[PDB]
């Protein structure tokens, strides 16, 4: 039965840990957001083809340029994440995340994941960004970023509402099969 190693990369502000916890528990953790998500695996059927999905977090490693790549080899598919309400995180896809992923894993599929969709239509978030002369990242921006990097899919999701979450991981798997 096919095993799949999936590594989730991106800035601290994407909510990597939260994404994974929320996906694996089927619930936003809510009260307390844990900082630890230990390497996980579970069986899932996709297009009626059962699969062992393995998820590795990378949170904490965001300042260690030579340590992050230790997780990269033998990865079957990457989620490269940015937050939809952090233009900086989005720009870092281009500047930081895609380069090192390609450098080390030149033929591994990438899904481009836009996180915190629950905040893109939020007055206080939008206002906090307007005050920095910024706006949230919209759909065509992600599509255009995906194209630039060779992503197989650009996908939007929220850990909070779980909108698009299951689908993110469904397509991680479809990108390998």
């Amino acid at each position: 039965m096919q095993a799949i190693k999936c590594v989730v990369v991106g800035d601290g502000a994407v909510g990597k840990t939260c994404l994974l916890i929320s996906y694996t528990t089927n619930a936003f953790p809510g009260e307390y957001i844990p900082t630890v998500f230990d390497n996980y695996s579970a069986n899932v059927m996709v297009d009626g083809k059962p699969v062992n999905l393995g998820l590795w977090d990378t949170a904490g490693q965001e300042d260690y340029d030579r340590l992050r790549p230790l997780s990269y080899p033998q990865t079957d598919v990457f989620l490269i994440c940015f937050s939809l309400v952090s233009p900086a995180s989005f720009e870092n896809v281009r500047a930081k995340w895609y380069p090192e992923v390609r450098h080390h894993c030149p033929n591994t599929p990438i899904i481009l994941v836009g996180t915190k969709l629950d905040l893109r239509d939020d007055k206080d978030t939008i206002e906090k960004l307007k005050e920095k002369k910024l706006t949230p990242i919209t759909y065509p921006q992600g599509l255009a970023m995906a194209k630039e990097i060779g992503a197989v899919k650009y996908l939007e999701c929220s850990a909070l509402t779980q909108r698009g979450l299951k689908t993110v991981f469904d397509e991680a798997i479809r990108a390998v099969l």
């Binding site: 307390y32 900082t35 904490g60 340590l67 230790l70």
Partner: protein, 179 residues
């Protein structure tokens, strides 16, 4: 509330890290050193390259560090001191990270399904590679938990400040050590 949930995670995850290293040592390492199964010639007597200094790292957490974190369970504001106290022990993550690249290649080029076989055999959800990334994960995670404590601990918080300093210095030194 928040300082207490963080401290509970710190401890709960420390326990699991000790369980995880232990598993690793008593399965993947043990089979190699046991003399109970067919060891590919390419990896023979090279368990020092595969597992690096993970024995020593485990001993540190299992003999000392988890025992001492437990003592700080009702003292989250002070737990930064735990890390200062044991700062020198963490230097052994520097060594481990230096060795991880060599470890990984060796397992690709020369182990075939040896370890996959043992994984299948014991019914382990984590591959040897999954176990062997954990020290690298764990040593970058301590700085996250201390930061979280800082967001919710008062003027009594230089007993986090210096802990965090150590746990930022260790990973950077490990990171700076790579070839």
């Amino acid at each position: 509330r928040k300082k207490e949930f963080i401290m509970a995670e710190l401890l709960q995850t420390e326990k699991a890290y000790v369980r995880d290293l232990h598993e690793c040592l008593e399965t993947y390492l043990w089979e190699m050193t046991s003399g109970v199964e067919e060891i590919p010639p390419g990896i023979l007597n090279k368990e020092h390259i595969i597992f690096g200094n993970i024995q020593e790292i485990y001993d540190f957490h299992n003999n000392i560090f988890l025992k001492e974190l437990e003592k700080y369970e009702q003292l989250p504001e002070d737990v930064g001191h735990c890390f200062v106290t044991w700062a020198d022990k963490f230097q052994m993550y520097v060594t481990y990270c230096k060795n991880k690249p060599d470890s990984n290649q060796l397992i690709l080029e020369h182990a075939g399904t040896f370890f996959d076989e043992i994984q299948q055999r014991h019914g382990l959800a984590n591959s040897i590679s999954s176990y062997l990334i954990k020290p690298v994960q764990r040593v970058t995670k301590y700085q996250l938990l201390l930061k979280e404590l800082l967001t919710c601990c008062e003027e009594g918080k230089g007993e986090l400040k210096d802990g965090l300093e150590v746990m930022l210095s260790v990973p950077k030194k490990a990171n700076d050590a790579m070839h």
